[PDB]
């Protein structure tokens, strides 16, 4: 069974290093690539740094200046150091695994850690009765949602891993319902849930490649269902 | 470090036998009890049962008609097996352990399992101002709450597991601030929240041992931190 786990110090001082580590099973480090995603607290998923089955490294810019991230494939281990961290870098830190044809589909329960440039929009909220359908549209650039077919969409019940739903704009993850749909009209994404249930009640992310080689999220949208 | 993990199907169809494996790391289910709990959605903790370090079996009166609990000491491994499984049975199914002298210290991070194919009374809401007070109450009665200093108090926010504030009554679990109290007279217990931080809004719940070699949670409480 595909298992990633996040462990390291929950509590940093300003100006030292954050270093987490990710212990992967039911897979090789060599065979898919890791990502690190985090999550300041009433904020969105922000990309972090990749390394993939080469050992090859993508960051954030934002982060770039601060951030390492190694492997040790013999241990099944890929590990994150962040330096010179304030309390803007207090977040719940995920690990997840990028595949070849399956998308970010797993993903660590994630690990709060305290110290103590295109963009992504998207509506706040949205709402709907049972049944019923809704929409959710994410705008970018010719960049980013524009650039291809790159586009990936997730669910988030808050205090929990989030949930692939959509990978390459239209392609439905395994496991999820098909009641699910992606399109993409070249510059704007668009989730569709055509028959609205209970637990569909969560956060949605939209997320994106960049020409830069780089990941890039929404703002997010809460979904309400009215009894 | 000290770590749980709750495993088995997160699908199970009605009237067959659900299955989980709690597979336990950094010390030996023969020093340290190890109980589960479950959740179901929107509604209270609920104590399942219970194997201590001789092996000694203890089942939630409720459930003990269905229950099941080995243990594998050489694998590290507890199991639950709950037969005869109804819609009734979905919840977030949570591994913890026992200790002589530091409370249920350790928690998984807990499983969902869903059932598909298509007392101890607490003030249910409390409030309190940002480095103010706030008080919660569990009533009870002379067998469980009013017996022994077997009282402990549980934070809950919702997407995690239960993290231990008080063991014995009055005890502040390890790593836990100071602005916790607890207070003990008759047949009631008292959590004490003295210095208000946004981060203290959750879920608290009151736990009792009892005359019959049970433990019994509290209705739980949510606490709002108003700006």
């Known amino acids: 069974q595909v298992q990633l786990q996040e462990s390291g110090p929950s509590l940093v001082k300003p100006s030292q290093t954050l270093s987490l580590t990710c212990?992967?099973?039911?897979?090789?480090?060599?065979?898919?690539?890791?990502?690190?995603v985090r999550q300041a607290p009433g904020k969105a998923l922000e990309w972090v740094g990749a390394i993939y089955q080469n050992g090859a490294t993508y960051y954030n810019p934002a982060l770039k200046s601060r951030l390492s991230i190694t492997r040790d494939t013999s241990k099944s281990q890929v590990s994150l150091s962040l330096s010179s961290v304030t309390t803007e870098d207090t977040a719940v830190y995920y690990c997840a695994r990028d595949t070849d044809y399956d998308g970010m589909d797993v993903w660590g329960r994630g690990l709060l850690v305290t110290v103590s440039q295109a963009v992504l929009t998207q509506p706040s909220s949205v709402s709907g009765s049972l049944g019923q359908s809704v929409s959710i549209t994410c705008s970018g650039s010719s960049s980013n949602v524009g650039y291809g077919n790159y586009v990936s969409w997730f669910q988030q019940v808050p205090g929990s891993a989030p949930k692939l739903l959509i990978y390459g704009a239209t392609s439905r993850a395994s496991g999820v319902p098909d009641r699910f749909s992606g399109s993409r009209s070249g510059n704007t994404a668009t989730l569709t849930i055509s028959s609205l249930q209970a637990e569909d009640e969560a956060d949605?992310?939209?997320?994106?490649?960049?020409?830069?080689?780089?990941?890039?999220?929404?703002?997010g949208t809460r979904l309400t269902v009215l009894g | 470090q000290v770590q749980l993990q709750e495993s088995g199907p997160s699908l199970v169809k009605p009237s067959q036998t659900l299955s989980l494996t709690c597979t336990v790391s950094?010390?030996?289910?023969?020093?340290?009890?190890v109980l589960w709990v479950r959740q179901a959605p929107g509604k209270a903790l609920e104590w399942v049962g219970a194997i201590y370090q001789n092996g000694a079996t203890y089942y939630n009166p409720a459930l003990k008609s269905r229950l099941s609990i080995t243990r594998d000491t050489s694998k590290s491994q507890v199991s639950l097996s709950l037969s005869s499984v109804t819609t009734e049975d979905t919840a977030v199914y949570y591994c913890a352990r026992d200790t002589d002298y530091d409370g249920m210290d350790v928690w998984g991070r807990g499983l969902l399992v869903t059932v598909s194919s298509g007392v101890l009374t607490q003030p249910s809401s409390v409030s309190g101002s940002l480095g103010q007070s706030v008080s919660i109450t569990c009533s009870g009665s002379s067998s469980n709450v009013g017996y022994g200093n077997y009282v402990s108090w549980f934070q809950q926010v919702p997407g995690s597991a239960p993290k231990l504030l008080i063991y014995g009554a009055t005890s502040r679990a390890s790593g836990v601030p100071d602005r916790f109290s607890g207070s003990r007279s008759g047949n009631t217990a008292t959590l004490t929240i003295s210095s208000l931080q946004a981060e203290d809004e959750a879920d608290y719940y009151c736990?009792?041992?009892?005359?019959?070699?049970?433990?019994?949670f509290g209705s739980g409480t949510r606490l709002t931190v108003l700006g």
């Open positions: 950094g010390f030996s289910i023969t020093s340290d009890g």
């Open positions: 736990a009792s041992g009892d005359s019959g070699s049970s433990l019994v």
